[PDB]
Subunit: 215 residues, 8 copies
């Protein structure tokens, strides 16, 4: 039991990415096939955080002129969803427990800045007028476990921002999932339902700097 418990993966998922540590060079890169130009999206992930600091990035999308087009990050017990800029922040106060698998979904629509944050399929936080009329542009860099800064040596990333733990089932839909669907994506057998922008198991994800597929 002790092995099967620690080797357990949440949905029917068969692969995860391990972050054995935080460091200045560990990150995952995500390579969507179709462009990340979005007027609304849902972004869901399974996270098993080892340790949480002031700001541990789960995933981050950013362009050249705006590093913070989308972020999902943990702040101790809290979860922080960011769209369009650091000032555009939705906080779920107390939701993440270390060392156990928890499912997160962000959800945002430009047309009313309508934003929503879900934990294990329950509405954790909601807000309106967040980045109203903003459009997430194409051509940015999407990462997991780290924020845009630089993989290209000379210092690397900010080690204090890095994720440590395990991730699986990273999915982005170019659209707001209905509440019913959001509960489905967290379901016991849900790993096969995957996003149309980023689909876990189809979209190229490269671990770097000591991140590993745990297959």
């Amino acid at each position: 039991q002790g092995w099967a418990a620690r080797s357990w993966l949440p949905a029917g998922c068969e692969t995860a990415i391990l972050f054995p540590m935080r460091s200045k060079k560990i990150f995952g890169s995500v390579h969507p096939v179709r462009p990340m130009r979005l007027e609304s999206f849902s972004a869901c992930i399974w996270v098993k955080a080892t340790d949480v600091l002031n700001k541990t990035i789960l995933f981050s999308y950013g362009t050249k002129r705006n590093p913070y087009e989308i972020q999902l990050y943990l702040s101790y017990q809290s979860i922080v969803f960011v769209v369009g800029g650091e000032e555009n922040k939705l906080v779920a106060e107390a939701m993440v427990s270390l060392g156990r698998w928890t499912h997160l979904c962000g959800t945002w629509n430009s047309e009313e800045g309508l934003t929503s944050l879900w934990v294990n399929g329950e509405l954790a936080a909601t807000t309106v007028e967040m980045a109203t009329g903003h459009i997430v542009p194409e051509g940015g860099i999407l990462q997991i476990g780290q924020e845009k800064n630089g993989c290209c040596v000379g210092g690397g990333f900010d080690e204090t921002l890095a994720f440590s733990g395990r991730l699986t089932g990273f999915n982005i839909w170019d659209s707001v999932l209905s509440n019913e669907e959001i509960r489905e994506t967290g379901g016991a057998e849900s790993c096969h339902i995957r996003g149309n922008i980023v689909g876990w198991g189809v979209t190229e994800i490269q671990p770097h700097g000591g991140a590993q597929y745990v297959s």
Copy 2:
């Protein structure tokens, strides 16, 4: 059980190749010791497809002058077996299911263009006069999960053609297997039955571009 099931391999096989994603660079290369000059053959494989598009390659043999000497590939619900050229398709209409280990095996003979396609040991489709009198040349490149295209350059493959999922038990015989032998190669303990042209566990197979042995 779920942790045992998520790691189960179909026959007694004890290695598979994981394709964690489709990508411009992911493929397996296969290096037969004896030449791929064939007047008849049987080609069997275990596949566990993650996701299927319009054409996802399971394996492909091609020469410099003809990229499509042999192909087995999946369409959204269908298995397509190609010999001698893209125009020579045998299509089995409706019997590949995602996330389930299924055994496929194709059989062809030049002498009457007699071709046959088998799924989990059942005859799925058959045809005659397919590539009649054609001989598969030697000196081609055999790949799994991707079709012959640009390989040494950055990227170079068509990302939409790539396999994603798991493969095991890829076998090629320089002969038409009898119907009883075809049912054997799918059997519960069949992994030790291996091809004389390509034998799983014997023929050198190199995963590239993020494909992994899952040993």
Copy 3:
């Protein structure tokens, strides 16, 4: 059962580092974020030694001018804790059995040179006036399984000093842990307890020379 036994990891821990052999090049490097300047410390680790010689290093800290600022090493059945110099040696006489996961943790305070060794939560040895008033300097190199000698080129480490076996849960605190906390760090569910100088799963640890994360 035996298969689940050979993969069992001691506390709730889910990653370990395997040393498949001793050699002139195998070691782990440890990269603390905050400086290793210490006036007292606690250093705990889980070890499953394959084979023990006159001196098998579990971990070693040192600088240019003093290679032996801290060492924990095994000497056949004995455990040896070193602080400030090779002359400053605390020996627990008969405490390591091969092939069994055992928890070791050392504690030292400069203010009285007070020093203790703990094995599976029981006080194994203690001494006073060991390196009294010494301060462990910063900017040194911390290693697991090997002592300062190699890196770079030439197969520089002493192969006879190298660890072989498995390690997990390497932790360093910048303080003397109370006896009750020391018994906690060996507990069945303790892996979430991690040090503020080195934390297992948080501090960057790089295996080299054939050392592997097993995870």
Copy 4:
């Protein structure tokens, strides 16, 4: 039990080396710290052969002047032990079954050329006057799964000689083990018994060319 049988390792052994295929470049290199100068020796290994040809090398010791100072190899159902030269050959006739873990020991003494083969702890063959008065020289290259000639010329080994399958517990003693000890090295809990020239888990073994530790 599907996964447990596949992942079972014979003695208490907690690592093996997988040869996923035969090829011109796959081999293991073994690096004894003390010299391979031998007037007698015992050499034991666990093998799980995938496929056996005319000659599949399990391990081979040779020098520049003589590639065949020691060989253990399989020849279909037969096991062949070589000392001092290809002419000096002891054959056990029908002793190796594919896909099953089996334990082999060779034993040789120069003083009478007395030689024995053991399979699963039973004496399988014996002979006398084999390489009488010969001394195995030091300074040779010891390999597992492949024979000396080749390497670095793009592999350059004879693909037909290569092992495929799994190996564990490779051990060499600089002495004739007694019959009682030989039965112990095959025991259910014997993996802690290791040789003084080559010890499994102690002597550096490097897999090359697609050979892998399975850990």
Copy 5:
């Protein structure tokens, strides 16, 4: 004077590619940024051939379905220009001398199949109705010194086809250059004249397999 001669480069160019040998893996890859779709073109190069066989490739463009969309190759003293297929040759006679820098430039127009071959600025051969109405397709692979073949397998190319010697000033224009311009591109200080499809010093060229920039 001896050293000045050995290092001399023909036009004002200050960069060449050396092919120190022919082999199964030496080639240059060329990466035009705008597509190689051509209804007419001019292709000029400086060659210093070390040794010429029956077919030594200077450059080759081909697609998956047609390896021979464009080739320029030497055949002993003869020079052979290919467009649209092997069957479509323009052969100049007795024109390349080994070890001497010579400028070659091909020219072709689909509209009348008008084709022309130039050596050191003099018309060497001309023909008409060659690949009339053919359009060179985009999306192929352009190489220097070697022909489209396998490249990501070990070796893979036909060693007898490979160039050996030095190359510089490889240029392609999406148009027929006038005779005046063709004489200019061979000029003593012409090297700054570069093509709009491939420009020397501008288009990415990667030497592989022991080819070197000697700049």
Copy 6:
């Protein structure tokens, strides 16, 4: 003469960086020891441009928040100097010529936004009130021949922005050089004059993506 001329380097300098082409991955990285926090600066370089587009970067400093803290780039015959943002631009109209070693210096002072641009030691453009009171921040990435966008990710730079040609003598001073000193940095024997922020031959510069030291 031509052999000596093609290898000539401008001042006494005895190394340069060659950009053989303008690919998506070619760039130089520059690693100042002391911080790039600047209230005034002088930046000088020797350039021998092969080919110039709308915008060919000579060097670029930028942070995560602002990619354009400092840029010097060529636009056909024009030189463009940027400080604090793309809107803050000083253009020298018509004085870079392809294939000729030319020396450039930009100087800027925050305290009046006083900015000046120099070509071969002659004042070429000047402006007041450019980025007045702005301070260039620390912690950015300094590059030569390319603009911050992103290595990894398969290259990820804009190919049209990349420099091609040769560079030497890149120097940055944390002060406005006097007009006399600017003429000195251009002098025929000036290579020993180097900056206190970036000094040619002391600051670490790494060529990437096919950029080469020519030594």
Copy 7:
């Protein structure tokens, strides 16, 4: 003058291989396309030895059974030519001077064991009945600057045997060259004369372990 002299190459040769040192891992590998089965041969090379020990290898051919099928090596001022075995040896007594380009060429014919050794085009030694009726086998490994031994990770070659200095113009003919031709291969422009078994500039030669092409 000295700048030209230090870079001068002997014949018209436009490429050399530098051995900067005599380490345990430096060697050149030579890959003839047609087999090294020889009943007679001629083997010529240019050498500029830095330092000579009792045995410095210029080139060596051997098989697993016999490392010494052909060797040319220097022994202080002496030159030693070996065919078929170390016992079969032709010694030119006092003929190699350090730091000077000197042409050596050996010549052997099995039919009478007729053997000849030439220095700068002059007959230096001759003998008969050397390896009479021996045939040099195919399938051996040909090296320059080092003798057949361990490559791999095997600790490498014998450092004392290694060449240091420069080599060019290594050529092997499958025949005895006439005396007139032997004087030609040393001539002022002779670098274009190359062997039919090994030809300098056409046969693949790979420098390893710090050996460099000087081009």
Copy 8:
């Protein structure tokens, strides 16, 4: 003359090592085959320093217990020769010119601690009773251009200690050279006279971290 002057190397030497910059990772490693146990020695080098700080290492020998067994390093105007420990300095005050080739020899004898420092063949400084009766130990690490730390570490060395510029003719004799011999080693054609412990061109020297052979 412009190129010939900057390409000139001091003695007959025809290779040097370039340090294009100081950095945390640039160094040379030196691998004497016979032990560095010394009771007296002479150590000579050609240096062309680009830039000199408080302490720029030319070469350094150190053990595990003592980093400073031997050092030769420059200071802003001065050469400092260290034997046995940092406290044992022989300082020559005012005689390295930046950018000009100069020949340095250190000379030390344990018996009277007699030490001598020579610049361009003239006695620069002398002292007695320096490290009297000390013996330089076996088994240390000898470096050029940097002081003993670990590398790895993503760097590790103090960047402010690193050499930048060019080095050639690094020679160590296990003896005090006579004054006559010391004037020889600096001679116009002295490159061929080389040390018996370290000989330039025979002892393996590996450049690391962007140090380059210039050949």
